[PDB]
């Protein structure tokens with residue numbers, strides 16, 4: 339556990355630096371960007387845009403982002419490597435499955451899925467040699483049967499490799515509780531696990547109860563808000579109507595209850611988005627022109643102003659990610 | 669239309685020859701073959717197996733196959749081009765959408781889908797320049813609202829390019845009737861359309877009505893007979909108990925009623941199958957070891973033995989596919 343795999347190769351733990359742990363270059367679907375790149379203008383336009391945003395995040399102090407796009411989010415690790423080199427920002431790539439698995443995934447056993455995630459972690463994604471550094475999974479409410487298999491296989495792959503697991507939840511449904519039960523049924527340590535989208539809820543008791551058990555709490559939706567666009571239903575459905583300040587005060591709340599070491603903060607931002615309504619990216623970029631720089635430009639100052647010490651901010655944004663990403667065998 | 673697009677470039681209508689009109693190299697899912705080729709042993713092993721199979725079909729007289737794998741069947745057009753060249757069989761690639769569209773597809777409008785189909789027909793699939801020569805679509809019962817957009821977009825793409833459409837049906841639910849209604853609502857001529865897996869039904873009159881209206885009838889499940897295999901529930905669920913002979917006799921029934929011009933026959937065979945239970949292929953290859961050669965080796969001789977004349981059999985296997993695939997604008 340002394341090296342993190344990025345899309346440009348292994349980096350030391352101290353090279354990671356200021357890290358965003360839940361981001362995407364592009365949220366799409368398996369095969370889609372290569373089949374229909376004109377949906378994003380062109381592949382070149384998408385890449386140029388990503389590099390712009392990554393360069394601006396780098397200017398604001400971001401050294402590493404974790405791209406948590408799985409196979410079924412249309413992860414294109416060749417694009418990641420390209421924009422990582424061009425922008426000079428480390429990108430950690432993901433294996434796992436999110437909630438749009440095709441038939442050839444859906445029909446697979448826990449054992450088969452375990453071999454797939456291990457392939458992507460140990461040997462490399464597709465034919466690239468680029469090894470994942472994290473496993474993403476997802477529920478949206480109670481796990482479907484397949485989703486239980488995915489979580490169990492993610493737990494098996496993490497135990498074999500030391501690589502952490504990170505989750506999508508419907509927080510309003512307290513998904514993290516079922517996710518934790520499943521992971522613990524496989525003997526996975528809660529410190530290997532980030533329960534994500536957790537700022538979608540204001541149920542602080544749900545959150546501290548998980549952190550108390552050792553889970554990392556991913557407060558990765560801070561800039562996601564449809565305030566001012568409440569008449570755009572597709573945006574409000576996606577973003578919620580809770581303000582960024584409300585979401586950020588959960589970070590303080592967790593800190594005040596003694597759980598600073600369990601917190602991971604991010605934007606869940608992206609430069610293309612095909613797996614929602616057309617032209618959604620335009621809406622999102624109007625909502626948050628800072629994009630991935632929103633955390634270092636708006637959130638960290640806001641917290642500091644509300645009296646969060648520098649030291650605690652550095653812990654959350656540098657230390658916790660390093661601990662989380664360092665591959666760590668039981 | 670003077671030329672049919674294949675994965676090696678345009679061919680003349682006469683180069684097409686004996687043609688299987690509903691086949692796959694590999695039935696999978698978008699991205700899946702490239703992310704997890706070890707599911708098939710390796711990509712190399714899958715290619716080699718497809719080449720052997722294509723070479724045996726070529727030996728039995730097959731000159732061209734139409735790989736009706738869409739984006740969401742995990743069509744890998746580079747793989748098609750590779751095995752076409754190595755086996756020396758023409759392969760026609762497909763555009764369209766089958767019944768496993770991802771979110772980024774399912775969320776698209778008829779206009780967007782139309783543009784995507786046109787892209788794969790007129791400009792080329794992915795970055796390859798390989799152009800589709802057919803549009804595959806699917807329902808499994810009453811069309812879902814997304815499947816209606818797909819069928820409308822297919823019809824618009826076919827009207828604009830002359831390239832035909834071919835369908836997956838649940839035959840027992842008479843899917844072909846709604847598919848036809850949708851295509852006609854867009855002004856597509858029936859002679860552009862093949863209603864596939866139609867040998868899955870015993871309802872002859874459902875078939876003859878569609879043929880009368882000018883539709884091609886795709887009898888492409890001839891070897892899909894789960895016979896002596898109720899021990900295997902997903903395999904007998906895949907296949908069925910109706911004998912291959914019974915399915916072939918539907919070809920003869922349509923001929924006898926005067927619709928030899930409307931008949932397209934194929935195997936719907938494949939060399940890999942990830943979108944089903946694991947090891948389904950071993951089951952399938954043990955059932956039909958002739959593979960894509962089953963049509964020329966078993967079916968055509970059986971029909972001749974039943975009294976079907978040579979010229980009629982040439983018509984169905986050479987002339988109907990040529991007419992179907994040759995790009996034809998309306999009026």
Ligand SMILES: C[As](C)(=O)[O-]
Pocket residue numbers: 365411436506606
């Ligand atoms: C890939 As997502 C839209 O759940 O951040």
Ligand SMILES: C[As](C)(=O)[O-]
Pocket residue numbers: 695741766836936
């Ligand atoms: C792709 As298929 C199983 O409907 O021939």
Ligand SMILES: [Zn+2]
Pocket residue numbers: 506507535
């Ligand atoms: Zn998510």
Ligand SMILES: [Zn+2]
Pocket residue numbers: 360361362406606
């Ligand atoms: Zn995300």
Ligand SMILES: [Zn+2]
Pocket residue numbers: 836837865
């Ligand atoms: Zn089918």
Ligand SMILES: [Zn+2]
Pocket residue numbers: 690691692736936
């Ligand atoms: Zn088929």
